[model samples]
Target: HPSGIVPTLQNIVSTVNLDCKLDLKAIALQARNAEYNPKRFAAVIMRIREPKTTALIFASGKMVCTGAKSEDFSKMAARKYARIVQKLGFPAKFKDFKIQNIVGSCDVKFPIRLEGLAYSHAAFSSYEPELFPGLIYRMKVPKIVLLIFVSGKIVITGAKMRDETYKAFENIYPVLSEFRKI
Candidate 1:
């Protein structure tokens, strides 16, 4: 009768602008965990422990990090990366920090009929079991992408906020019920 189930955010990507120029080479040399490959990409890659995240630090002070199973962890990871620059003696200021993308998943318990949903939601879905198993549904208004599997396990991506994930699954729950694999 209701949805007690919730979406668990597995991976999140957040972007930060330091608002100051950075010396990538110096960051690579001094920051032990930071590695730079300017010949390939003009950024230094750094990894941190515990919270388990990675950040790509650029000369323009643009950085992106993805990690953690919790909501506030992304911001913490971003600040931790900034702290690394603080240690490197770079005056990097946090600016325009925001969540770029969120990957969250949940199990519906009842198996779903992917083929039935593919044609029913032709406007928003594409499925090909011959090539790959999951059905891809792109919600138009909310602009979040859903990955539907036969086992009733689904993933939602491209959500900027946690509420959007809940909003999305609420909108989708009824549709999947119609195609329940009984």
Candidate 2:
């Protein structure tokens, strides 16, 4: 379609040694098929750099920014990032960007059907009762719950914490942003 946008984005993420927790790399790899249409390049990769306290939201050539010590700071940064991306003359919609939820200690984890992603018992084999003082419930499909583990892996179920997961999405934005927009 365009050029090397996807590959460029992949390269940038690789250079940064950051992988989308959502595993968008698999999607990118599948993009090489002959039936692949570059027009459909509209997936976002979000991630958080724990050490930097920074979050990024990337989609193709566009990215949403968020996550500072304060929500205001993150919002401002997001607006700024959106503008920067728009200025590049790429197809990005900053106004449509939304602020999701923030993942913090106060968040709770409950049992719910994870959409699209498969469920694995291995994800919870070593469950520690004490480590998770937050909410843990078995709820209906599309419920919201935070998945925390002693080994440091976290997944939020449902949509109550949309803002937090959106923040998580911001963390991985750059990975898709760096693409060449081919």
Candidate 3:
């Protein structure tokens, strides 16, 4: 019973709290796809191109809207980076918006048997395959973190919503069709 295909969301790690504090060098000199450099990073690396997200702008106000692909385009790119830091004048308050995480991927078209599904899901898989050829499954009741590869693909990451990455890919697609690979 595994052919309905559903996994697709590439990424979506929302977070917001632009309650107030923020100046990051005057929003990186009046924003324009901002970018600050307090010796490498202290937040303020904004970017936006429709749904192509990327944010971090901090300074106590907080924000972290990485590359969206869903979750309503990562809450509309964290309300367009709190409306570009409220038009660069501060007072940004999109407040407590949250999504945390929700990456997805799929391809279970066939090949798969990562060491017999990590030795029969050895207490929730881990397969080494000489360091890492995939197979990391660690789904603790929708905690999600799959990676199982071997041609079957699959990715699903630490989801916070998006139905918990579609309920951990429908509970690991029938255990990946019982390690199908033949």
Candidate 4:
């Protein structure tokens, strides 16, 4: 109750399209932290402005952007990247911008009984220490994957919009405390 603990939205993954073919070779020169080697596997991978994310540009055009704190910030980040090509004599239409997924993390602030949680929800949970340390729970209704750890930290993924994480956080809080370690 009165705890200030809240779920933190880690980042947003947004991708959008361009007019047509993007010249990776030319843009990589302009793109500082650019990456490409021997055709670079058909795409130009550029790491721009170290907030820690990628502007994964494609040969067929239509780029992917990530590493923003807020929702639109991701869209804005892509536009700025797209705008760079816009100035480079290429048409950056930036059409059909969409958010692919969002990741949000939370600390329950108490140790959780991971085994019991997994045992209780076998169909939805998977826990194999030899393969992975954390338990992976795939929620059916919201269509998101949850990674739960014994340290009381849970990582959420596969969310389309922002609030779904919050919804999952609220919905899981009680279930988590039910499996809390004594």
Instruction: Identify the candidate with maximal TM-score.
Output: 1
* Model 4 residue 3 distance off true place after TM-score fit, in angstroms: 9.1
Assess the local accuracy of residue 115 in candidate 1 as a C-alpha lDDT between 0 and 100: 90
The pairs that clash in candidate 1 are: none
lDDT of 1 at 87: 78
Residue by residue across 1-182, what tens digits does model 4's lDDT show? 22345678888898989867888889878767678764437667766574456788887788888877667778877887787777877877978899998998989889989899999999999999789989998988678888999999999888888777777677777878899999
> Model-by-model lDDT, in order?
0.90, 0.33, 0.85, 0.81
lDDT of 1 by residue, 84-166 (tens): 99878988899999998988999999999999998999999989888879999999858899999999999998888888888
Off by over 4 Å in 1: none
TM-score, one value per model = 0.96, 0.31, 0.37, 0.91
User: Per-residue CA lDDT of candidate 3, range 96-141, in tens?
Assistant: 7989888889887888888887887799988887888898989899
Candidate No. with top lDDT: 1
Better of 2 and 3 by TM-score: 3
List the candidate numbers ranked by TM-score, top first. 1, 4, 3, 2
lDDT tens per residue, model 2, 64-134 = 34344334444555555444333444444444434344333221122323221212333322334566532
Residue 60 Cα positional deviation in candidate 3, in Å, after optimal superposition: 21
